[PDB]
Every structure is written in C-alpha cells, then in structure tokens.
Amino acid sequence: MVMSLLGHYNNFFFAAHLLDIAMGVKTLRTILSSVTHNGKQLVMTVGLLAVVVYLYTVVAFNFFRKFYNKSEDEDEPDMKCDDMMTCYLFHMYVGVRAGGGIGDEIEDPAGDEYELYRVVFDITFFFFVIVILLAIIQGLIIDAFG
Amino acid sequence: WGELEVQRVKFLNYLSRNFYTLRFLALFLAFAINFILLFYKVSDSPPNMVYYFLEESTGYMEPALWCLSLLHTLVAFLCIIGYNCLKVPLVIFKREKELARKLEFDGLYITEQPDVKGQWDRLVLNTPSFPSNYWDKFVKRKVLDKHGDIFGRERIAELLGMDLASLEITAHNERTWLMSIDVKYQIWKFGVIFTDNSFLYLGWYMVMSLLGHYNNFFFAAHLLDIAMGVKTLRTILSSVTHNGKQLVMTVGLLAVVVYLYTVVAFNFFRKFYNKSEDEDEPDMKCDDMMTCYLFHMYVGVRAGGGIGDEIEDPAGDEYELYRVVFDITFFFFVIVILLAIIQGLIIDAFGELRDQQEQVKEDMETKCFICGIGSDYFDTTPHGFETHTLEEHNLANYMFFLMYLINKDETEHTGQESYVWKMYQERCWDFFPAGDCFRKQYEDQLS
Amino acid sequence: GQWDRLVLNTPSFPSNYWDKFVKRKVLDKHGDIFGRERIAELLGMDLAS
Amino acid sequence: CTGNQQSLAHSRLWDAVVGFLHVFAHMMMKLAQDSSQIELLKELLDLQKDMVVMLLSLLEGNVVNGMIARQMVDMLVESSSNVEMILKFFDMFLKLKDIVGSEAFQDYVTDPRGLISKKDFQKAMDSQKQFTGPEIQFLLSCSEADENEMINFEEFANRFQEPARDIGFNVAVLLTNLSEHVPHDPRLRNFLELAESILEYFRPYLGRIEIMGASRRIERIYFEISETNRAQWEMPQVKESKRQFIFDVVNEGGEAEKMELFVSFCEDTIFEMQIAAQISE
Numbered sequence A: 001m002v003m004s005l006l007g008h009y010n011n012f013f014f015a016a017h018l019l020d021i022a023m024g025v026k027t028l029r030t031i032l033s034s035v036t037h038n039g040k041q042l043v044m045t046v047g048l049l050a051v052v053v054y055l056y057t058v059v060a061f062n063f064f065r066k067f068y069n070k071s072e073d074e075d076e077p078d079m080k081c082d083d084m085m086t087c088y089l090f091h092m093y094v095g096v097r098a099g100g101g102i103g104d105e106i107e108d109p110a111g112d113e114y115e116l117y118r119v120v121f122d123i124t125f126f127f128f129v130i131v132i133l134l135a136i137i138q139g140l141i142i143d144a145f146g
Numbered sequence B: 001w002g003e004l005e006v007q008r009v010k011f012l013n014y015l016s017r018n019f020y021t022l023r024f025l026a027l028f029l030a031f032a033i034n035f036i037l038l039f040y041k042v043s044d045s046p047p048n049m050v051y052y053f054l055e056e057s058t059g060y061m062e063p064a065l066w067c068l069s070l071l072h073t074l075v076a077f078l079c080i081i082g083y084n085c086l087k088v089p090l091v092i093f094k095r096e097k098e099l100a101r102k103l104e105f106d107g108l109y110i111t112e113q114p115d116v117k118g119q120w121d122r123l124v125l126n127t128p129s130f131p132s133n134y135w136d137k138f139v140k141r142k143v144l145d146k147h148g149d150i151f152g153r154e155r156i157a158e159l160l161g162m163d164l165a166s167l168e169i170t171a172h173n174e175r176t177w178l179m180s181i182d183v184k185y186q187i188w189k190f191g192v193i194f195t196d197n198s199f200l201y202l203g204w205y206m207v208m209s210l211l212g213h214y215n216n217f218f219f220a221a222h223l224l225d226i227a228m229g230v231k232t233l234r235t236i237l238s239s240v241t242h243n244g245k246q247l248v249m250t251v252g253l254l255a256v257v258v259y260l261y262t263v264v265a266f267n268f269f270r271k272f273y274n275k276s277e278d279e280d281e282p283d284m285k286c287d288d289m290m291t292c293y294l295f296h297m298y299v300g301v302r303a304g305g306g307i308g309d310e311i312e313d314p315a316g317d318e319y320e321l322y323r324v325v326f327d328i329t330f331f332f333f334v335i336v337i338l339l340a341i342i343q344g345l346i347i348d349a350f351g352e353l354r355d356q357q358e359q360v361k362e363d364m365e366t367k368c369f370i371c372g373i374g375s376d377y378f379d380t381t382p383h384g385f386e387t388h389t390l391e392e393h394n395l396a397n398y399m400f401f402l403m404y405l406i407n408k409d410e411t412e413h414t415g416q417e418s419y420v421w422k423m424y425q426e427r428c429w430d431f432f433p434a435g436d437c438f439r440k441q442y443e444d445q446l447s
Numbered sequence C: 001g002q003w004d005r006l007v008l009n010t011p012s013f014p015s016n017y018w019d020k021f022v023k024r025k026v027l028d029k030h031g032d033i034f035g036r037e038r039i040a041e042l043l044g045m046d047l048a049s
Numbered sequence D: 001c002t003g004n005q006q007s008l009a010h011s012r013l014w015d016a017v018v019g020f021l022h023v024f025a026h027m028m029m030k031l032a033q034d035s036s037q038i039e040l041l042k043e044l045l046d047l048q049k050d051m052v053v054m055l056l057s058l059l060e061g062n063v064v065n066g067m068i069a070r071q072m073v074d075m076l077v078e079s080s081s082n083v084e085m086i087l088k089f090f091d092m093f094l095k096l097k098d099i100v101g102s103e104a105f106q107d108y109v110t111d112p113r114g115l116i117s118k119k120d121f122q123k124a125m126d127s128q129k130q131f132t133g134p135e136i137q138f139l140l141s142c143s144e145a146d147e148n149e150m151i152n153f154e155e156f157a158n159r160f161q162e163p164a165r166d167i168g169f170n171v172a173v174l175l176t177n178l179s180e181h182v183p184h185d186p187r188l189r190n191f192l193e194l195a196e197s198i199l200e201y202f203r204p205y206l207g208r209i210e211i212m213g214a215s216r217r218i219e220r221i222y223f224e225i226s227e228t229n230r231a232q233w234e235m236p237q238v239k240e241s242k243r244q245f246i247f248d249v250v251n252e253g254g255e256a257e258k259m260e261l262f263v264s265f266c267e268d269t270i271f272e273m274q275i276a277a278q279i280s281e
C-alpha cells in the first residue's frame, strides 16, 4: 500500500504491483526463494568473479595498452585503458557479457607486437570467466531448483 | 647477554600470541592498499610515459602507500618467523613418529631399503641429537634389542650412529652454544619445511612483497589469497587438478582434432580464408599452417558459431556444397560436443565434491565415531543420541584417558589400567568394542 | 528476548490467551529458591498478597 | 582373575568394612573442632583414598546383575545408619563456595575488615531453603569462633576441600559405578538423590569409557581429568584440528586403519599442548 498512494504522483510506478504474482502463488515463489536459498555462497563466488577479472585487467592496463580501442574515428581517439577504474567497468561490461572472449571488441592482432602472448591472454580469459565460473552460477541456481 | 636471551623469546611469545588476528590485519591492509591502487593513471606528460597518481584535493595519499607497503612486508616477516616459531613441531613430530614406527615394527632400513623421502631420511639416524624433539629417546637401542640376533651388531651400531655403544650401555647403567651443535640434523629438518606444502606457499607470499617495491602493480597477485584462505572457495581451484589427469589429454584431443581439420582447408580451400577488407592490401592467413593453426585455435573454439563467420559468404559455386559439410562437421564436433565435455568434467566434479563435503556431515550426524552401530536403533530411547554422543562415546574423553595415564606412575595403575597400556605401547588396537556398546545384548537385563 | 520484557508487568498481559493464572504458578514453581519481593515486582503483580 | 572374589565375598571382610566405615564417618564429627585437628584428619582421609580403591577393585569384571554386585550394596543396608553422614559431609562443605557465589548473601555486612559476626550469618543461613535447622551452629563451631565475632570465610573456604578434592571425586565414582550397574532396586536409589551434589560438581571431571576385554566381556571404567587441561582443550588452536582430522577418516581411511591414525592424532595434539603449555602465560 506504500506504493499505491505514491502511484498518484506518477502513474508508472504501478508496474511493481505485478510482482505480486511471484509471491502470491507457491509455484513461482520457489524461483525467487532459490536465489537466497544459496546466496550465501553465490555472493562470494560472484565476488570471486569480481576479483579474478580485476586481477586479469591490470596486465592489459600495463603491458597491452596498444589495441584497447573501439573508436573507429582516427581524429577522435578515446581508448578506455587510460584509467583502470574505467577499464574495470569496461571489463565487467563486456567480458562476462559477450560469451566469446574479450578480443572481439578489439580489432584483429595483425601485428607482431606480442602476437603469441595475446592469444594466450584471450583464451585464459575465455577458459576461466565464461566457460567455467559462469557455469557455476548456472549450476548453483538450476541444481537448487531441482 | 642473559638480559636479552630470554627477552627475545618473550618477544616471540607475544609475537605468536595473536598470530591469527595479526595475519587477518596483514590480509586486510594489503586488500586496502590494493583497493587504493585503483586510482593510478599513466600519460605522456611528466608529473617516456610516466605512471603518476590521480588525487582530488588530498595530499598524503601517495606517501601513505610507501609506508603501508613496508608495513605489509614487515608483518609478512612477522607471520613467517611466527610460523617457524610456533608450528615447526607439527611438521617435526609425526614423521619421526613414522620413522620410529618403521624402525621398531617393520625394519625399513635394516631388513630392506626402498622414493623422494626414504633416502633423505638417512641423514638423521647417526647424529646424537636425533630424538631430542620426541618423547621416546631410547629408540636406537630397542631396535638392537629387536634385531640384534639376526644381523651383525658392529654394522648396525655404526649405521644408527651410537658412539661408544658398549661403553655407554655400562656407563649409563653404573653412573660456545653453536659449537656443540650438529651440522647435519638442522639442515636435514631445514629441507623438510621447504619440501612440505605450507611453508613454501607462505614464503611465496613474501617473495612478492619485497619484489612489490620494484613496481607497485605486482601486489595484485596477493588477492588470490582469498581463494586458498577459505575452504569454501578452495574446492573450485582444487577441482581442476582433481580431474586434470584426463582433462589435459582431452584438451590435447581438442588440440589435435582441429590440427587434423585445418590441413584440408590449408590444401583444398585456400580461396576464402581472408579477413582483410582492403583489396590492395591482401593478407590471408592460410599461407603458413603454423599461422593457420594459431588462427584456428584463436577463433574456432572461441566464437561458438562455427568457423565460416570470420570468412565471408560462399556465393560462388566453387565447392559450395562441400564447405557446408566442412563447417558443420567443425561445428558438430568442436563447439557442440568437445566443449561440453570440458564443461561437464568441471561442473559434475564440483557437484561430487560439494556433495561429499556434507556427506561427511551426514556421517558425523548419524554414525558413531567409535564402532559400527548407526543411530536408527537409538530411536526407541527418547533423546538417546546425546547421552551416547557427549559422555560415553566421546572424542575428547578418550584422549583425556590417554593423557592421565602418562604423568603418574605405573605402580598406581590397576589391572585394566595396565591392560589398556601394555598393548598400546606395542600398538595393537582390537581393544575398542567394534560391535557392542550398551545396547545389543545388554538389553535383556536393562529396565 | 529483551523486547519480550515490556509485556510481563502490565495487568492486561494474559487477556488474549486462555490461561490467565500464569503469573502465580511461576511463583508456585520458583518461590522457594529466590526472593518473592523481587519476582513479584518483576512480573508486575500490584498488591499480590 | 575373579577367583579372589570367591573367598573375599564369602568370608569376614564386609562386617569389618562397616566397622571401619562407622568410625570413618564418626571421627570427623569431633576432629573439626579446632584448627590443630586437620593435619592428622587428612591422614585419615588419604586413608579414605585407598578405602575407596579397596572396593573399586571388586567392580572389575562386574556382571550386571551378579550376587557380588548385590553383596556390594547390602553393605549399605547392613550399615544404613553411617552413610547419610559421610554423604552429607561432602555436601555441607561443597555448597560452601555456592553460598558466596550469590550476591545476595555477600552484601550482608559490608565492613572493609572482613570480620562478619556469627549471629549475622546464623539467621541468614536460617532463611535459605537448602539448609537444615539444627545443622547450623555445629558447623559454626567447626568454623573459627574468635569470641563469636569472626568467621573469615576466605579461610573457612579453601582449607576443608584441600583433602576433599581427591576423595570427593572417588566417592562420586563410587555412587555412579552402582547406579548403572544394578538396575531396578529401591533403596540404592534414594542416596544418589541425597548426594547428587558432588556428582553435579564433578560433571566436567567425570568420563564414561568402554574397553573390550577378557574374551568378549565389556565393562566401563571411570577416570579423572584435571582442571588445568579442562578449560584449555576448548580453544581454536585445536578445535579446528579436530575437524581437520574428522574430514579424513572416511575420505581416505579404511575400517581397519581408522583409530591407528587417531592415537597419533591424540599424541600430536597433546604434544602441541606440551609446547603451548610451555609458551603459555
């Protein structure tokens, strides 16, 4: 009821009243109850997800400053590996997101400047953060559902 | 130096008193400076490219870190010699217990001789200060009481290192600190702390901190201490080497199947493998197969939608219906199946280990810790679980019973108190029940 | 456990439950081991005797 | 070997035991009068130390319902009148420290001297419900009088359980051997209700432990644990080494090699408590 008298200030905050279906029936109560059923380990392993890429991005911030650029304009260059607070928000914006590595936002490594090291960099991002540690967060929801 | 000789062990006492909380603050202050590390920036301007620090209306943010880092290295030194101050007796006691066990019972070095530890354990018998850190120090003579009848005495006395044995056996029956110390036993037990798992990891924790003053950014590997510190997140990194023995060979299968699959594109499908959109500057990568194989393991196990999305559309009739077999027999094999094996051999093993993490909780909750009677037949007696768990079949009271029989004399002990000890010393343990305790056939006279 | 200490001393405590002699059988229970004058003021019996 | 108990039960031992026990309960009725009466009375009670291990040994190979076990307890109804005294004597001096444990009995005479008068304590002990009427002034006479104006319960306290720290535990053992050995019997049950005080005081110092023996005949043995090693086993220097080896007796251990590791676990833990008690404050 604290939303309904507030709902006359702007009409569109009546949309949160449609989450009453989630707790009203017992069938769809267990889906939202399953997150806090195993949240006690899931918040700490998504903290692991938060700190492993924070470990993994300083080596790109220090040694691989060359190619992290999506600006196709030559006169207007704005790379995001200038401040690591920007780089870490960028990395958790695309790396846990795209599902195909990190070097698809970045153009192709046609140069010989550390060519066979970035192909180790990208796949040790790939084998860790999308292949495995996302499948743990999948499993700790779906198994608990079962 | 007697005013300082006990003063430094008094220092070491309150050094080891709050070892746990000192280690906790040693973790958290490194975490805090690794958090304040998030505000570093590099540019071409001097304060070539110079790494400077970005600050907003505060001046002492940068001179704080140069003392906080030395603080972290100093408390790293503190916890290292605190480890070597309290619990080198844990890595000391059990393996010379194991050694005296095979000296007295099996004869591991006299009746035969065998790895990595078995021949390094031969630089410990001949020194006279061998049993100085274990309770039983007559261990070198009851082995001669054991097997002085089958072999020669003069060889085993020189092998076990008894200096003037027949003189000391009559003498003990009848009636410059480092200069008297040994040269071999201390380096022998200096080898085992480097051999064992914990001390080399704790030294790896400090080999980065003095290196961390060369460049500030190698403090980031100190945040992997969370992974092995808690036991909850230790099993994730332990699950990889739990089934790595087959996973490295099936990722070798992943490495050789695409190495099989790329020579047919290197020989017969040289036409289309080109991402260079410039017509005047063409650089295809199917010219050298060492380049082509690095390309193939860069995109094929990567993209998850085949291989012919890096390559433009096959609008031509030059082997059109063969490349549509090529791409899907790449697709059905290397992303659909053999990646799902590497998914399954991690997630299943996660499930197996986390379920056996708590089936031992089930075993403590239902079984008995002494014998083989389960808790299903203790249900008729109301709350008969705790009266059997806390007092009778208890884990602490038996080691208290093992405690109180050591201090006082055996001219005090009774028939049962000598019954429990005279085969405890020769170490045969059918003295526990293992099948009957207060319930099975004592129920006929129980009201 | 300590918010439940603002309910014993009022005389209208057991007015919404069936047994309303609950403040005196606790004195029948443990009026022998402790003091009566302290537990009567703690349970809130105004002019108990 | 139970062949000694063939003749020691049938011959003339136990009327001599009741003849000893009568004077054992009657000597300390008068040898608590003066302060110069205790260094020989404690000689008599570490004779009681071996008087209890006299009949502790006839519980060896104890059949559950045996005529030896019934002739253990017909002792105390042939001599029923001299056991209440030695059972309440270990209660009238062991709730002694429970008088001071309450704050209501402390703030009577708030003098900074510490000389509380005897009459200020007599009517105070007459108000408690755990006392006996005519049994106040006799223990006041057992206490130091000093013109009836000085108690000094600091030395009333610590002097009379220095010989009653070792005999009280073993007479608690004596009452708890026979409670679970012979069941369903009326008159051996009342006196444990009358003397549960030393049992309650020695709940942390008591342990019930079973060993298989004598060609499949298991019977329980009691032991003592000291107060120094009591309060220090419950510390996180060792309570997580507890679970450190609890995790690995079913994870890798077999049935034949489970306690072969446990005895080395106990000696390694008592080894680190050896070195930790060395470097303890």
Ligand SMILES: CNC(=O)c1cc(Cl)cc(C)c1NC(=O)c1cc(Br)nn1-c1ncccc1Cl
Residues within 6 Å of the ligand: B020, B021, B023, B024, B025, B026, B027, B079, B080, B202, B205, B225, B226, B227, B228, B229, B230
């Ligand atoms: C396994 N790493 C260590 O041994 C360890 C070794 C060194 Cl040199 C330093 C630290 C901070 C270490 N890390 C811990 O010591 C630690 C990390 C975590 Br996460 N928890 N935790 C801990 N565990 C038990 C009691 C107190 C603490 Cl602080």
Ligand SMILES: [Zn+2]
Residues within 6 Å of the ligand: B368, B370, B371, B373, B393, B437
């Ligand atoms: Zn049992």
